[PDB]
Every structure is written in C-alpha cells, then in structure tokens.
Design a protein around this ligand. Sequence first.
Ligand SMILES: CC[C@H](NC(=O)[C@H]1CN(c2ccc(C(=N)N)nc2)C(=O)O1)c1cccc2ccccc12
Length: 217
Amino acid sequence: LVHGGPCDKTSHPYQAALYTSGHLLCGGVLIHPLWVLTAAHCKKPNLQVFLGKHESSQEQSSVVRAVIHPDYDAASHDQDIMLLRLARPAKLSELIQPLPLERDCSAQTTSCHILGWGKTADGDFPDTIQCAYIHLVSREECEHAYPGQITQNMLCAGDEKYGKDSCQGDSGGPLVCGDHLRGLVSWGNIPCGSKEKPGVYTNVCRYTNWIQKTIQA
Ligand SMILES: CC[C@H](NC(=O)[C@H]1CN(c2ccc(C(=N)N)nc2)C(=O)O1)c1cccc2ccccc12
C-alpha cells in the first residue's frame, strides 16, 4: 500500500500473507481457525499461508481447497472473493486471531483502515506490514469515478488528502471498519493512489451466506 506506514506488531492479528512457490502473491484475512478469505484473482497452484507474521508468533499452512466464488467475473472483478481451507488449524495466539465479518450492508461507519505488504509509493516492496486510515466513498461518487464498473458486490474507499491506497501485492487484504471485515482489496487506479479515483473492494457483507455455506458444508 502507498502513503502509509508500518502497523503495530499487535494491531493486525487477522492479517494473512499468501505465497506461491516462495513468492509473495497476496494478502488475506483469517476469519475462522480453518479459513482465510482473499480475492478470487489470487487463485494459484502451490499456495502457502503464513499467519502471525509482521518470527516466533508466525505459523504456516498448506491449502486443502481453494473455493472461488461461482460467479467471479475476471474481466470486471465482479464477485472477487475466494475461501482457503487450511490444512493445519490456526493456533490462536493473540498475534493470530480471526476478524468478524460486517454482516450489515448498511453499517454506518465510514472510517476504515487497510493493511498489506504490497507496493509502496517508491515502487518497492516492504518487509514490514504497512497500514493506512481511509474512508468509505459513496456508491454514486464511486460509479462516477469508474462508469460501467461498480456493482453492488463492490465498495469504494480512499483518501482525498494524501491518496492513501492499496496496491499490487495487497490483494485480498482486509478493509477494516469498526473492527469488522468490510471489504477485500480488489482493484483500483494504476499508479496506485486514491486522491482522484478510490480503491475498489469486494463488498464482504454480500457474501455472509456463501461464506457460511462453504465453511459449514
Ligand atoms: C495476484 C497477482 C497480483 N495482482 C494484484 O496485485 C492485483 C491488485 N491490483 C490493484 C491495483 C490497484 C489497487 C488500488 N489502487 N487500490 N489495488 C489493487 C492490481 O493491479 O493487480 C500482482 C500483480 C502485479 C504485480 C505483483 C507483484 C507482486 C505480487 C503480486 C502482484
């Protein structure tokens, strides 16, 4: 993410890092000892999930099953969500904790934050997790930002002052509002930066029932 700074070691216990063949690929959110949520465009073979990373608190697991939303549309990023079934149950340890979903699509909090190990503004990739406060942007204003591209399955969020924004390598990471999972990093402007066009996030509240069915099955 661009224009933020390093999170506190204790302020991000739900954050996952997703690797493929030894390369950082995406972020992700622990939402249940056995399940990580991320973006559907993060589907790759040979996935490795690292939890409790920012190391002693860290833990690593293979993926047993990667369930892409049935209706994911790659060209438009509509329905950009994936569930990952961990081989090894997560060891909850205060540096590793699930995050509750936002279940109400009309929740009023518009002050949020984002997190990831994706690209910083200098085009580099950081060893330490980055954080930024941003705000939700109204659907109408986001539709104007990107005509023909914002569905009910997405939410927009950004920062008019400094342009704080997610970026490549942040995909699947959490948009957190009122300490609930509101969104997943999905797509946005390139070069990354939100002073003109907001970041676009998968609208997590619309997937409560699909998440519930997949886990509980
Ligand atoms: C799964 C591959 C990975 N895909 C992405 O990161 C997606 C997310 N995204 C993007 C763009 C802008 C914003 C925003 N402005 N809010 N948010 C997300 C893209 O443009 O592509 C990837 C793409 C390109 C370089 C990478 C380098 C290292 C690791 C992963 C990389």
